[PDB]
Coordinates of C-alpha atoms in Angstrom, one line a residue:
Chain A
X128 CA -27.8 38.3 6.3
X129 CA -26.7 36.3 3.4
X130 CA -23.4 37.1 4.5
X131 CA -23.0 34.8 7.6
X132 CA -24.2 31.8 5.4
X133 CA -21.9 32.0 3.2
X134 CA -19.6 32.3 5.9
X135 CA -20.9 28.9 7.2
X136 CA -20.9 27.1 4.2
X137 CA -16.6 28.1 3.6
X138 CA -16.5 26.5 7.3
X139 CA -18.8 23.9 6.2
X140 CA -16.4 23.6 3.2
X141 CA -13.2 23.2 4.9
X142 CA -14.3 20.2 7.3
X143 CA -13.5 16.1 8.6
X144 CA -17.8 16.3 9.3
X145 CA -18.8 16.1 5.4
X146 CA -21.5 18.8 4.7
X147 CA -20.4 19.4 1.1
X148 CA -16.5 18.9 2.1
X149 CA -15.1 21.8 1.1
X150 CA -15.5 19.8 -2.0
X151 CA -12.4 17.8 -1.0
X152 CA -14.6 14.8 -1.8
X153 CA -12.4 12.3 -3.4
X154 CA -13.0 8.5 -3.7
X155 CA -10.3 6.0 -4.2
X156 CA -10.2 2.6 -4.8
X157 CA -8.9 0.2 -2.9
X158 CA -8.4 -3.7 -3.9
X159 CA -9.7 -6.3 -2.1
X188 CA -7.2 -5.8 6.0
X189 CA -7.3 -8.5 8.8
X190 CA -6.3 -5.7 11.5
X191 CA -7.0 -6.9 15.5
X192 CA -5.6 -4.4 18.0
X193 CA -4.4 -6.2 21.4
X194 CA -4.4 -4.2 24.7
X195 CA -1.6 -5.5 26.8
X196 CA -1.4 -4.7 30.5
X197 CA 2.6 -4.1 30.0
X198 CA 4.1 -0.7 29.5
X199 CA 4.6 0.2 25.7
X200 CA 7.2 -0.4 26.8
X201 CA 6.9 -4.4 27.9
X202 CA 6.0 -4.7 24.0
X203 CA 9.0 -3.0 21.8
X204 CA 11.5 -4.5 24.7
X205 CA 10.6 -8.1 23.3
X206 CA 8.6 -7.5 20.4
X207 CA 9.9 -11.0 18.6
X208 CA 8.6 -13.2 21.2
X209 CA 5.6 -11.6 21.2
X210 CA 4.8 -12.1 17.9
X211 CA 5.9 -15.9 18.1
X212 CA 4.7 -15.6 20.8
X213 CA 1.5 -15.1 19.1
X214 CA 2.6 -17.2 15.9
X215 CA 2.7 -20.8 17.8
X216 CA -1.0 -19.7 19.5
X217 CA -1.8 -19.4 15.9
X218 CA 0.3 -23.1 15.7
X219 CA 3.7 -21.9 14.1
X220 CA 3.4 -23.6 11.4
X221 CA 5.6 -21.9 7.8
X222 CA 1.5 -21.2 4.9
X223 CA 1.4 -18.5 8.8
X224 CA 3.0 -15.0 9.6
X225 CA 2.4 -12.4 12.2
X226 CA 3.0 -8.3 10.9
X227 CA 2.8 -5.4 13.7
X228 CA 1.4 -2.5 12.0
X229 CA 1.7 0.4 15.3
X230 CA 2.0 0.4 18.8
X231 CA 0.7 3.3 20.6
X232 CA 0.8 4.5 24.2
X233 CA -2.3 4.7 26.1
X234 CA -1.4 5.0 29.7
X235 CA 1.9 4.9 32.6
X236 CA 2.0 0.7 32.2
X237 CA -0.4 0.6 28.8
X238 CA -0.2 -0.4 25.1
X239 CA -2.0 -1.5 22.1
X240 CA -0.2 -3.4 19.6
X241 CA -1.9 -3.5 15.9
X242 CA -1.4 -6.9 14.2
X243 CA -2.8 -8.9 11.1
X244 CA -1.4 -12.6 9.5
X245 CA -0.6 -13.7 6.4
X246 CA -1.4 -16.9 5.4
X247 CA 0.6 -18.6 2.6
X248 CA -1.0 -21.2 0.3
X249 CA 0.4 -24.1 -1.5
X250 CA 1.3 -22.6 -4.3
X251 CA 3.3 -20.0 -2.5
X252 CA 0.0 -17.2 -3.0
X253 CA -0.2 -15.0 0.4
X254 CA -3.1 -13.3 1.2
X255 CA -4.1 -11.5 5.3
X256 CA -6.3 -13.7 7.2
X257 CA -9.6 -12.3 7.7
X258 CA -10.1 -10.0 10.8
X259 CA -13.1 -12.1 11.9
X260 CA -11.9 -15.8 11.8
X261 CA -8.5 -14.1 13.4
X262 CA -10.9 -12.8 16.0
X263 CA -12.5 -16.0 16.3
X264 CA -9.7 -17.9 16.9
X265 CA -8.8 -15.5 19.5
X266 CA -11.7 -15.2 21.3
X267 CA -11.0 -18.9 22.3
X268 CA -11.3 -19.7 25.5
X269 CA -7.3 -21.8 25.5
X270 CA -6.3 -19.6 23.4
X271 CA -7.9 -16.3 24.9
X272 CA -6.1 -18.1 28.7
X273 CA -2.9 -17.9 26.3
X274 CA -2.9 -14.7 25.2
X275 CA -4.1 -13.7 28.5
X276 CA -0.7 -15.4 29.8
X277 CA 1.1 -13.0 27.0
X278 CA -0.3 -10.0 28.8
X279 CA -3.2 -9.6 26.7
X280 CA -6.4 -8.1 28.7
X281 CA -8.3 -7.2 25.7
X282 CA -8.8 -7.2 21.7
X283 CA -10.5 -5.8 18.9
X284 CA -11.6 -6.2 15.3
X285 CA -12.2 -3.3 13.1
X286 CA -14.7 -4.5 11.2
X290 CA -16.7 -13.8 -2.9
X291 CA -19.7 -12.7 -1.3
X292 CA -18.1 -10.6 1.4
X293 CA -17.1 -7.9 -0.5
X294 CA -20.9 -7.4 -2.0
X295 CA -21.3 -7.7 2.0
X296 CA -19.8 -4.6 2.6
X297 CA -19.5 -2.2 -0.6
X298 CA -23.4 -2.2 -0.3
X299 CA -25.1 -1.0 3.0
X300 CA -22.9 2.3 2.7
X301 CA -19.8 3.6 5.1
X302 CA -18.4 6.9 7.0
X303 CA -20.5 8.8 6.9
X304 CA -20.5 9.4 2.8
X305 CA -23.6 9.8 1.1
X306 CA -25.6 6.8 0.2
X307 CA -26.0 8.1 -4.1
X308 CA -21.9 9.2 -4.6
X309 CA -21.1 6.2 -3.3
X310 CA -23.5 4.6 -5.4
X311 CA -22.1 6.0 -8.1
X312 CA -18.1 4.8 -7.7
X313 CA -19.4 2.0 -7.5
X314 CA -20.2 2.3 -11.5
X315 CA -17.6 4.4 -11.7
X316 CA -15.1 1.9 -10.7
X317 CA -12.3 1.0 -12.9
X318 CA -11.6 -2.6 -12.1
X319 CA -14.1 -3.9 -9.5
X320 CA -11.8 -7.3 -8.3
X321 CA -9.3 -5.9 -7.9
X322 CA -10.9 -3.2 -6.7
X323 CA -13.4 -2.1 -4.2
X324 CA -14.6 1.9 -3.6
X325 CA -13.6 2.8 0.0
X326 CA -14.1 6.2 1.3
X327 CA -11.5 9.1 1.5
X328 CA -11.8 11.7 3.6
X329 CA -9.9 16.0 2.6
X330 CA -5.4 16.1 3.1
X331 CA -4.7 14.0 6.1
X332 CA -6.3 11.1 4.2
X333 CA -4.1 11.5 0.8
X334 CA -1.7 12.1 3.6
X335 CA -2.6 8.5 4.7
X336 CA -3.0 6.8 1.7
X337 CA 0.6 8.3 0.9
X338 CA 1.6 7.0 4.0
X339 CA 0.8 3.5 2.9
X340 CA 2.1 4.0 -0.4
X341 CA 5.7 4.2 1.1
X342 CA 4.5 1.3 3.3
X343 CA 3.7 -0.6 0.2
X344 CA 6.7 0.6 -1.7
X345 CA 9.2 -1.0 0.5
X346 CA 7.6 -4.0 0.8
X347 CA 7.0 -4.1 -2.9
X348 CA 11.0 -3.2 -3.6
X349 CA 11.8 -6.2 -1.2
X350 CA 9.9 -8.9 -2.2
X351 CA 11.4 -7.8 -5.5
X352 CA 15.1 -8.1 -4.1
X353 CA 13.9 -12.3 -3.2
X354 CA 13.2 -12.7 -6.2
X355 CA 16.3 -11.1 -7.5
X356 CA 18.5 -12.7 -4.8
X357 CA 16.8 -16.6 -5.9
X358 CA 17.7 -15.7 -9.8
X359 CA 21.1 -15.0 -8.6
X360 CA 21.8 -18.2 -6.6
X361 CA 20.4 -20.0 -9.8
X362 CA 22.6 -18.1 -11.9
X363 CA 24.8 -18.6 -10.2
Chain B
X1 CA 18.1 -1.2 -17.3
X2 CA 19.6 -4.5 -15.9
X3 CA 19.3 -7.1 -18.1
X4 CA 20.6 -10.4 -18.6
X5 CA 19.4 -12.4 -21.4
X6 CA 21.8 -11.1 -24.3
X7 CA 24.3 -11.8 -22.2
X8 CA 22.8 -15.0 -21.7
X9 CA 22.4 -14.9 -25.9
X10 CA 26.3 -13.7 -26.3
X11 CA 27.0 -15.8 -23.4
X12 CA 25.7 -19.1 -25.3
X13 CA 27.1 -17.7 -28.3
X14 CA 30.4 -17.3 -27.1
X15 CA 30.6 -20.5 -25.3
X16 CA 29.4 -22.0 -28.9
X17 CA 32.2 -20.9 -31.1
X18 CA 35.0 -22.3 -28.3
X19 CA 35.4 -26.2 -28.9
X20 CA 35.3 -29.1 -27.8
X21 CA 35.7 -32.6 -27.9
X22 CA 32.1 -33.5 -28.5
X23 CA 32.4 -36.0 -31.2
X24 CA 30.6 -33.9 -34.3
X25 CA 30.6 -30.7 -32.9
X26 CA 33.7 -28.6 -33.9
X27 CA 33.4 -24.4 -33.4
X28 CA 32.2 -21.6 -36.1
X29 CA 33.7 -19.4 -37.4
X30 CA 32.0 -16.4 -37.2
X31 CA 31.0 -14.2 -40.1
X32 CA 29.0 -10.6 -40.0
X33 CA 28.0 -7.3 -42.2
X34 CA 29.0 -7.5 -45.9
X35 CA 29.6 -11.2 -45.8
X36 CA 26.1 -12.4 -43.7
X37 CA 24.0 -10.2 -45.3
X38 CA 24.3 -12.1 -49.2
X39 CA 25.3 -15.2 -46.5
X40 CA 21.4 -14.3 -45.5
X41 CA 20.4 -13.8 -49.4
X42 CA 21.4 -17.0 -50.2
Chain C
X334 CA -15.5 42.2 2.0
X335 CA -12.0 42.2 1.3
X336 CA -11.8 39.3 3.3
X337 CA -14.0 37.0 2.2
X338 CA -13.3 37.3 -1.1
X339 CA -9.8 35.8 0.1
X340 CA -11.7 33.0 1.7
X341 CA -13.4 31.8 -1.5
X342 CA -10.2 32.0 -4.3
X343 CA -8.5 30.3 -1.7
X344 CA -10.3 27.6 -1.0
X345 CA -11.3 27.0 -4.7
X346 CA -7.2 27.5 -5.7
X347 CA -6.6 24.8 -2.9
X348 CA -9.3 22.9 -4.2
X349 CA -8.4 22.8 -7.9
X350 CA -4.9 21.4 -6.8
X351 CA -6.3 18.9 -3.8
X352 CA -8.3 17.2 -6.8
X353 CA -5.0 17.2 -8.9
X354 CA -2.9 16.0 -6.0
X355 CA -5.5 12.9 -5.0
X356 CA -5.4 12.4 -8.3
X357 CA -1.2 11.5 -8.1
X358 CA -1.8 9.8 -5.8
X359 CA -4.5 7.5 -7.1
X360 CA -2.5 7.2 -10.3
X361 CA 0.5 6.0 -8.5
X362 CA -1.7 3.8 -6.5
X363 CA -2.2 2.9 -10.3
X364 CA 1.3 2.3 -11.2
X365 CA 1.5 0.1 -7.9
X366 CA -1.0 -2.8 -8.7
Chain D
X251 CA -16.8 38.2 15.7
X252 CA -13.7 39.3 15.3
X253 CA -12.8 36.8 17.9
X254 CA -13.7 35.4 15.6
X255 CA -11.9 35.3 12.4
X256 CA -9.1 35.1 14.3
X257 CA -10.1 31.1 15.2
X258 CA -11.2 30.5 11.3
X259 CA -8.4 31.8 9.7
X260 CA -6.9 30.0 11.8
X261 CA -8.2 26.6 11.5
X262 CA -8.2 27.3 7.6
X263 CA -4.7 27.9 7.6
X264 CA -3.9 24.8 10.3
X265 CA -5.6 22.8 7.4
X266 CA -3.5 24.5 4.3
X267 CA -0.5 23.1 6.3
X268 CA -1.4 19.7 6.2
X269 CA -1.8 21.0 2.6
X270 CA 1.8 22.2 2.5
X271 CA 2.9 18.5 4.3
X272 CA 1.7 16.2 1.8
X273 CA 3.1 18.4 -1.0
X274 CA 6.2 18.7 1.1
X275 CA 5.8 14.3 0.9
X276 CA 5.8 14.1 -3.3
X277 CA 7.5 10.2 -5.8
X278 CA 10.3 8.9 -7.3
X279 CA 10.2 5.7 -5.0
X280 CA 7.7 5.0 -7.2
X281 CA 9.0 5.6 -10.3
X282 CA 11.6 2.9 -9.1
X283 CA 9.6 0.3 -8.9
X284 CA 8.5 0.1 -12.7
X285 CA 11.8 0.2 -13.5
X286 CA 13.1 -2.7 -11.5
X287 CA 10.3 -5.1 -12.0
X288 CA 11.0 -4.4 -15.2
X289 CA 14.2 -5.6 -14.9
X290 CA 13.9 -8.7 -13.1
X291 CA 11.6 -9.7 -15.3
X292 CA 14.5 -9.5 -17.8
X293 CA 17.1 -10.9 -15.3
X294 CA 14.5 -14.2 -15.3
X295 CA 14.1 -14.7 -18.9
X296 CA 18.5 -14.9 -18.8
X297 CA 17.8 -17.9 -16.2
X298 CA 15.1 -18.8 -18.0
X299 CA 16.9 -19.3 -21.1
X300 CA 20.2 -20.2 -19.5

C-alpha cells in the first residue's frame, strides 16, 4: 500500500533520529565551550551544601590566581550518595579580554596525577570532556548525525564565519535549548553591563 | 534613553557662565534665538 | 482518509511556523552578538 | 493498528507541546539589552567628556 508509507515517512517526519526531520532541519550558528563534568562520590547533595568551596576549591588546584574563574553550569542527581557537577573556566588576559579555557588543556591539567590526588581529596572519582586551526579541526569531519552535503553547505552559507561557526540543531526542544541559553546569556550580558555602569558611576561620581 | 552627555554639555555650560576668580576669565552672558541667530550671521 | 489528511496540514502548519520561530530565535541570537 | 494511532497521535501531539512550550517562552529581555547598551555607551561618552 502506498498508504502505510506515507504513514512512515509523517513518523519519519516528526523525529530526534533525522530521516528527513519532519523537515524541522534548521542550522544555527554558533561563534566560536570548555565543559568538563566531575562525578563526585558525595550526595548531590554534598555539592550544593558547599558549593563555594568546591569551586575554590577547585580554583586554587587551578592556582587561584585573579586572569582564573570557575562557573558551574548543572548539577544533576545520578544515584542515593551521587552527583555530577558541570564546570568550565574563564581565563582573563592582560588587557582585561576573557575567554573559557579549552575543554582539553582543562582536561589535561586535570588528569594530573597531583592534581587528579587533589581532586580525588575533593571527592572527585571521575571526569569527562565533551569533546585558529581548531575550529577548521572540527567544522570539517561532520557532527550528529547531520548529513555530510547540508552541512557543507552552511558552511557557505554562513553569515560571519569568526565569529561564527555552523553547529547542528536538532526539531523544538533544541530552539527550546538555544532559548534556554539565550536567557542564560541575557543575564549575564545585562550584568556585565550593570559593572560597567556601576565603574562610570564611581567616576562620575 | 539614559543619557548623560548634554548634561555633561549643559553641565559644562552652566558651570562656565558662574565666575570666578581666575585671573582673565570673567562669566558670559548668555544670548539665544533672535539675537544668536544674526550673532551667528555676523 | 479523514485522518491522514489531518496528519499532513498539520505537520506542514507546524512546520511553516517552526522555521519562522528558529528563525526568532536566530535573529535574536543576532541582536545578542 | 488502531492500537495504533492511538501511540502516534499521541507522540505527535507530545511533540506539538513542546511546540506550545517554546511559544509559551517568547522576548522582550532582549529587546532590553539594545536599549541599555545603548545607553551606557552614552552614559561613557558624559565621563568621557567630563
Amino acid at each position: 500500500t502506498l498508504l502505510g508509507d506515507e504513514r512512515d515517512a509523517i513518523l519519519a517526519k516528526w523525529n530526534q533520529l533525522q530521516a528527513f526531520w519532519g523537515t524541522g532541519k534548521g542550522y544555527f550558528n554558533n561563534n566560536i565551550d570548555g565543559l568538563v563534568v566531575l562525578v563526585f562520590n558525595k550526595k548531590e547533595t554534598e555539592i550544593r551544601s558547599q558549593q563555594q568551596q568546591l569551586v575554590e576549591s577547585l580554583h586554587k588546584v587551578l592556582g587561584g590566581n585573579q586572569t582564573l574563574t570557575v562557573n558551574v553550569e548543572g548539577t544533576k542527581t545520578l544515584p542515593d550518595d551521587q552527583t555530577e557537577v558541570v564546570i568550565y573556566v574563564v581565563e582573563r588576559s592582560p588587557n582585561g579580554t576573557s575567554r573559557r579555557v579549552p575543554a582539553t588543556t582543562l582536561y589535561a591539567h586535570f588528569e594530573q596525577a597531583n592534581i587528579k590526588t587533589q581532586l580525588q581529596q575533593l571527592g572527585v572519582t571521575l571526569s569527562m570532556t565533551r569533546t585558529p586551526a581548531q575550529i577548521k579541526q572540527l567544522l570539517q569531519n561532520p557532527p550528529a548525525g547531520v548529513d555530510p552535503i547540508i552541512w557543507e553547505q552552511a558552511k557557505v552559507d554562513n553569515p560571519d564565519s569568526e565569529k561564527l561557526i555552523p553547529v547542528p540543531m536538532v526539531g523544538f526542544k533544541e530552539l527550546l535549548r538555544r532559548l534556554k541559553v539565550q536567557d542564560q546569556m541575557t543575564k549575564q550580558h545585562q550584568t556585565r553591563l550593570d559593572i560597567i555602569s556601576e565603574d562610570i558611576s564611581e567616576l562620575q561620581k | 534613553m539614559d543619557t548623560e552627555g548634554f548634561g555633561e554639555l549643559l553641565q559644562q555650560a552652566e558651570q562656565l557662565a558662574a565666575e570666578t576668580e581666575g585671573i582673565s576669565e570673567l562669566p558670559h552672558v548668555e544670548r539665544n534665538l533672535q539675537e544668536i541667530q544674526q550673532a551667528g550671521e555676523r | 482518509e479523514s485522518l491522514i489528511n489531518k496528519w499532513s496540514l498539520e505537520l506542514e502548519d507546524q512546520e511553516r511556523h517552526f522555521l519562522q520561530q528558529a528563525t526568532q530565535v536566530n535573529a535574536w541570537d543576532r541582536t545578542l552578538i | 493498528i488502531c492500537q495504533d494511532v492511538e501511540n502516534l497521535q499521541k507522540f505527535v501531539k507530545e511533540q506539538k507541546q513542546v511546540q506550545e512550550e517554546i511559544s509559551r517562552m517568547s522576548s522582550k529581555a532582549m529587546l532590553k539589552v539594545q536599549e541599555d547598551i545603548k545607553a551606557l555607551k552614552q552614559l561613557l561618552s558624559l565621563a568621557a567628556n567630563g
